[PDB]
Amino acid sequence: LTSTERLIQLFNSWMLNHNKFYENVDEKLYRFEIFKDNLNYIDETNKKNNSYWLGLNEFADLSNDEFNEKYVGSLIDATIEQSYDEEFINEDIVNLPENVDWRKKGAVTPVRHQGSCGSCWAFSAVATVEGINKIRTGKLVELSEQELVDCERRSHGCKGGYPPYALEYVAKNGIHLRSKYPYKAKQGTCRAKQVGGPIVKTSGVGRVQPNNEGNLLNAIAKQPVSVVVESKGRPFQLYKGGIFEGPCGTKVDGAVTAVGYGKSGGKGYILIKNSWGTAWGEKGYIRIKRAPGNSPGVCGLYKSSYYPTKN
């Protein structure tokens, strides 16, 4: 029962350590109650003895339903796909690298925060291209996701999107500088035209053979791939570190960027850069378990991957 002062004192640090203010006293009271509940889920679950751990991250504050409301940032879907530029000339056989990490080769930008906007699709693409660019130009630069939300009207801004559409958009129109067309957390009129600075260009997009690990790994190996996953899970909400191995279903709702893969003695994984800031997961990133060869992947990870192709 002393525990109570302990908890209060504790909720308190978590608060300023994540720059959290509440206007009225009762909200804090409410928040505190949520927090407490979350914490319990976090213990019952860490005691489970799995390969990762949950924690008091950026979202400890919120309830699960509340979390999906403002941050899941959905995907939309098309059928009998447009049969893309270069159908990934099908891979499989391993005995290719052991560990890849496109951050070592200065090909990944700092991590970002998508706010209360369902723009993960835009963010995902921007990343994969920022990468394929440095792999060619030997120069890494900060591109604007904002353009994609405002132009590229096939996908619906904050209401969700489709990454391939975002990609085909570059092949056809290039893309501007983040510094020039900043991100604003809501869709505006496509100002692509009245904004200066160089524009990165590309030629096409490539679709990788789904539901197979080999195909993906080899793809990742050449450059960073945009891929999908089911992020609505409660575990996922409160992830802190490790090799996440569920629980999570295959009903995908978000776009992320796989920037590597590796193995930590026994367990193999794919390394992803997410759009939730640095206070979530491992400094913005998450490492997900690898399902071997044939399946949709853990949390439907293998389900849908694409990459820009540059001249």
Domains contained in the chain, CATH given: 1-311 (3.90.70.10)
Q: Does the bond joining 247 to the residue before it have cis omega, within 30 degrees of 0?
A: yes
Q: Which conformational region is residue 10 in: left (phi greater than 0), alpha (psi within -120 to 50 degrees), or beta? A: alpha
- Locate tokens 């192709």: which residue? 309
From residue 19, alpha-carbon distances to 30, 54, 61, 83, 116 in Å are 18, 21, 12, 47, 17
Give the per-residue SS3 of the chain: CCHHHHHHHHHHHHHHCCCCCCCCHHHHHHHHHHHHHHHHHHHHHHCCCCCEEECCCCCCCCCHHHHHHHHCCCECCCCCCCCCCEECCCCCCCCCCCCEECCCCCCCCCCCECCCCCCHHHHHHHHHHHHHHHHHHCCCCCECHHHHHHCCCCCCHHHCECHHHHHHHHHHHCECECCCCCCCCCCCCCCCCCCCCCCECCCCEEECCCCEHHHHHHHHHHCCEEEEECCCCHHHHCEEEEEECCCCCCCCCEEEEEEEEEEECCEEEEEEECCECCCCCECCEEEEECCCCECCCHHHCCCCCEEECCC
Q: What angle do CA 296, 127, 197 make, to 5 degrees?
A: 155
Closest by Cα among 61, 52, 49 to 19:
61
- For residue 261, the tally of other CB atoms under 10 A from its CB is 23
- For residue 195, the tally of other CB atoms under 10 A from its CB is 16
What is the token pair recorded at 154?
A: 């096939």
Amino acid at 98: E
Residues paired with 101 in a beta bridge: 260
Q: How far apart are CA 216 and CA 1, in angstroms?
A: 52
Q: What angle do CA 115, 119, 121 make, to 5 degrees?
A: 140
- Locate tokens 């505190």: which residue? 32
- Locate tokens 């950026």: which residue? 58
Amino acid at 272: I
Q: How far apart are CA 21 and CA 206, in angstroms?
A: 45
Q: How far apart are CA 187 and CA 56, in angstroms?
A: 31
- Locate tokens 């991250």: which residue? 57
Contact 128, 256 (CB under 8 A): no
What is the token pair recorded at 289?
A: 């378990």
Contact 257, 273 (CB under 8 A): yes
Contact 306, 218 (CB under 8 A): no
Residues paired with 243 in a beta bridge: 287
Q: How far apart are CA 113 and CA 274, in angstroms?
A: 9
Q: How far apart are CA 102 and CA 90, in angstroms?
A: 22
Q: How far apart are CA 201 and CA 218, in angstroms?
A: 24
- Locate tokens 């008091």: which residue? 56
Amino acid at 38: N
Give 19's contacts (C-beta < 8 A, 6+ positions apart).
none
Q: Which conformational region is residue 24 in: left (phi greater than 0), alpha (psi within -120 to 50 degrees), or beta? A: beta
Closest by Cα among 118, 72, 130 to 259:
130
Amino acid at 88: F
Q: How far apart are CA 126 and CA 130, in angstroms?
A: 6
- For residue 196, the tally of other CB atoms under 10 A from its CB is 9
Contact 211, 297 (CB under 8 A): yes
To one decimal, the resolution in angstroms is 3.2
- For residue 256, the tally of other CB atoms under 10 A from its CB is 25
Experimental method: X-ray
Q: How far apart are CA 176 and CA 224, in angstroms?
A: 20
From residue 16, alpha-carbon distances to 11, 13, 58, 260, 269 in Å are 9, 5, 11, 33, 34
Check the CA dihedral 132-133-139-145 and report its sign: negative
Q: How far apart are CA 160 and CA 167, in angstroms?
A: 15
Closest by Cα among 163, 126, 87, 146 to 259:
126
What is the token pair recorded at 251?
A: 């009903």
Contact 86, 206 (CB under 8 A): yes
Q: How far apart are CA 187 and CA 125, in angstroms?
A: 17
Contact 276, 260 (CB under 8 A): no
Q: What angle do CA 92, 300, 148 make, to 5 degrees?
A: 95
